[PDB]
Here is the input.
Amino acid sequence: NMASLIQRIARQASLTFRAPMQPGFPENLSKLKSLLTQLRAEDLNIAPRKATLQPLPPNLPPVTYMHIYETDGFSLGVFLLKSGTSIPLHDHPGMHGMLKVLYGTVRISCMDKLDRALPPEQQFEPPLQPREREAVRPGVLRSRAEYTEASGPCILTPHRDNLHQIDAVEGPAAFLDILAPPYDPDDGRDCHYYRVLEPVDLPREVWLLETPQADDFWCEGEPYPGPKVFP
Amino acid sequence: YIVKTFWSGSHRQC
Ligand SMILES: [Cl-]
Ligand SMILES: [Cl-]
Ligand SMILES: [Co+2]
Here is the structure.
């Protein structure tokens, strides 16, 4: 008589994401957060993964993705990070996101673009090439903390914490992620990667440089083992 | 190769 928790999360995500403007949104978002707070790895039939202590060979991805469900309103799935890996700093243009750690520990660094020119004398280490000096833009580093399955969900919105980097801390980690709306490159909603620059206490201003997807980062799908989300 | 994903946008999946 009772649907699985992941079914109920998907149903509530659909109700919640059909932006701030809509009425009933904050209450629906609060309810979704409370569902995610309850979620554990076992509810998805995902056993916690532990380190292999072996180097990662060049042909295997550092990160994998289990797809659970997607509509035009939201996407739902799990990202699984191997030991020592990171998902590089990236944005989510015009999107909301919700993350819940399932096992392991992640460091999430949260940032935003400030919407200015780099001062002429400013220097970075390593030094920038001329095209990079032209392209750097100001940002703000808002937070940088470690999260576990006990932390409860992390939220991002179109205008706050919209840039994040996610590092696996002391071994593999995995998290459930909801994006709303999902990315849509052909609609002009794409994922952009960034470098944070070190020139030569939070929140503090930083400098951001858009950069291609790192050569050693990519993500491949793998089968989702848990209860299925049904229309 | 590049795939247009809904979960990390235009993604070089290699
Ligand atoms: Cl049911
Ligand atoms: Cl420089
Ligand atoms: Co993200």
Chain A touches chain B at residues 65, 67, 70, 75, 77, 90, 177, 179, 182-186, 189-191, 213, 218-220 (CB under 8 Å). Chain A has one domain: 5-221.
